[PDB]
Amino acid sequence: CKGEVNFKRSKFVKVPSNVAPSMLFELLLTEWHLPAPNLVVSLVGEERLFAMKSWLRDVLRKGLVKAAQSTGAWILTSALHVGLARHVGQAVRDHSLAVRVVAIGMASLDRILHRQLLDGTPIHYPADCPLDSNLSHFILVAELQLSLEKHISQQRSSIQIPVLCLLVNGDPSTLERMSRAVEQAAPWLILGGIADVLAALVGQPHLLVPQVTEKQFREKFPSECFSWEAIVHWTELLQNIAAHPHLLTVYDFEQEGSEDLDTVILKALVKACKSHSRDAQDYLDELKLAVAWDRVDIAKSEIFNGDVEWKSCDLEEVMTDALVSNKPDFVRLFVDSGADMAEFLTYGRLQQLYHSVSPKSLLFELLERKH
């Protein structure tokens, strides 16, 4: 079901559970006419008591600023998540006001207030719970999000589209869902909340945590004391999760020696794709993203370390992209990677390059007037 909220209208798509993810994908793209996804970053952690220090908030702000600058992506921030997420919605709205990034409010309907008012045309839902009015879209209804992620990581010049999850100041309730994410072939990045526990407990000489989990749950958020059976279940859960480390990665941005947000993103992405397979056609999308960030160090060190083998045949599209974007370092790297200009350059390709002249340029006006 399609609906609009004249609040500047926000879209509502009825989300019946166990629906086809491809159906929702097609509905979103068609009805919303939004650009193709170059990246899909989904949030998994949000809490009202969750507070962000100035450093982590700034590196989150600078990161989203750089993301909206060149690449643009989709931030699957669940609506009706009142807390720190509303500030994120206001911030992304202000930064987009200042290629573009989009945010989707994939959220249920039970926790929303005035749900009967919107169920049965500006639906006024003024509640002092209601959803954050900073977002301009929503999907009205964890398994749905996981299946949507598994679907997006399967949609496919044969290019893929990356998908990543970013958790921030999570609660011990997402852990179960998090386990499914380990089986969903999706990379995960950890920094605030239970994230500190998951980080300090991911690398240990002892695989199982029969007693350290209790000490962690006691030292961290000691307001709620859970049952011992729950702690044993969650210890087994964390064991089964950390059984697969090559998809999970943690980094500390407060150490003052941290690399930029965009860097670790691509680092974890290539780390995941390396364990996924070694197909040259695989790393393409992420590689394109690297060009979008002008990141050459990680391009040469990680991608072109000699592990994967490159053939002159596949580099054509990415080389053209690097050329039109005016980034000579990557051109040098590619031509040193075996790509030969002698056979790549054709008169049709050369005309294409001329067809790629920017309209506001002077050469464009000169050629147009001459024509």
CA distance 256 to 117: 49
Q: How many binding residues for Ca ion (CB under 5 A)?
A: 3
- Record the tokens describing residue 188, joined without a space: 């995960």
Beta strands in 232-292 (DSSP E): 248-250
Nearer to Ca ion, 236 or 282 (CB): 282
Nearest one of 172, 173, 223 to 196, comparing CA atoms: 172
Question: Near Ca ion by CB under 5 A, which window of 196-204, 275-283, 298-306, 357-365?
Answer: 275-283
Q: How far is CA 189 from the centre of its chain?
A: 10
Question: Near Ca ion by CB under 5 A, which window of 60-68, 107-115, 276-284, 335-343?
Answer: 276-284
End-to-end distance of the chain based on CA atoms, in angstroms?
A: 51
**Least Cβ distance, residue 282 to Ca ion (angstroms):** 4
Question: Near Ca ion by CB under 5 A, which window of 95-103, 143-151, 164-172, 268-276?
Answer: 268-276
**Least Cβ distance, residue 158 to Ca ion (angstroms):** 11
Nearer to Ca ion, 144 or 299 (CB): 299
314 binds Ca ion per the rule CB under 5 A:
no
Q: Which of 236, 260, 282, 314 binds Ca ion (CB under 5 A)?
A: 282
**Least Cβ distance, residue 283 to Ca ion (angstroms):** 6
HEC string of 39-101 equals: CEEEECCCCCCCCCCHHHHHHHHHHHHHHHHHHCCEEECCCCCCCHHHHHHHHHHHHHHCCCC
160 binds Ca ion per the rule CB under 5 A:
yes
CB atoms within 10 A of CB 277: 11
Nearest one of 258, 287, 252 to 273, comparing CA atoms: 287
Question: Near Ca ion by CB under 5 A, which window of 50-58, 209-217, 226-234, 274-282?
Answer: 274-282
Nearer to Ca ion, 5 or 164 (CB): 164
**Least Cβ distance, residue 324 to Ca ion (angstroms):** 22
Nearer to Ca ion, 282 or 316 (CB): 282
Q: How many helices (H) and strands (E) does the chain have?
A: 17, 10
Nearer to Ca ion, 164 or 273 (CB): 273
Nearer to Ca ion, 111 or 276 (CB): 276
**Least Cβ distance, residue 371 to Ca ion (angstroms):** 41
Nearer to Ca ion, 161 or 175 (CB): 161
Nearer to Ca ion, 163 or 322 (CB): 163
**Least Cβ distance, residue 148 to Ca ion (angstroms):** 18
| Sheet (strand 40-43) strand order | 102-103, 74-76, 40-43, 163-166, 188-190, 248-250
- Record the tokens describing residue 135, joined without a space: 């977002």
C-beta of residue 47 within 8 angstroms of C-beta of residue 94: no
Question: Near Ca ion by CB under 5 A, which window of 28-36, 159-167, 218-226, 348-356?
Answer: 159-167
Q: What string marks each residue from 109 to 148 as x (binds Ca ion by CB under 5 A) or -?
A: ----------------------------------------
236 binds Ca ion per the rule CB under 5 A:
no
Residues 6+ apart with CB under 8 A from 26: none
Which 3 state secondary structure label does DSSP give 14?
Answer: strand
Q: Which residues of 203-216 are buried (b: 16+ CB within 10 A; e: fewer)?
A: eeeeeebeebbbeb
Nearer to Ca ion, 185 or 212 (CB): 185
What residue ranges bind Ca ion (CB under 5 A)?
A: 160, 273, 282
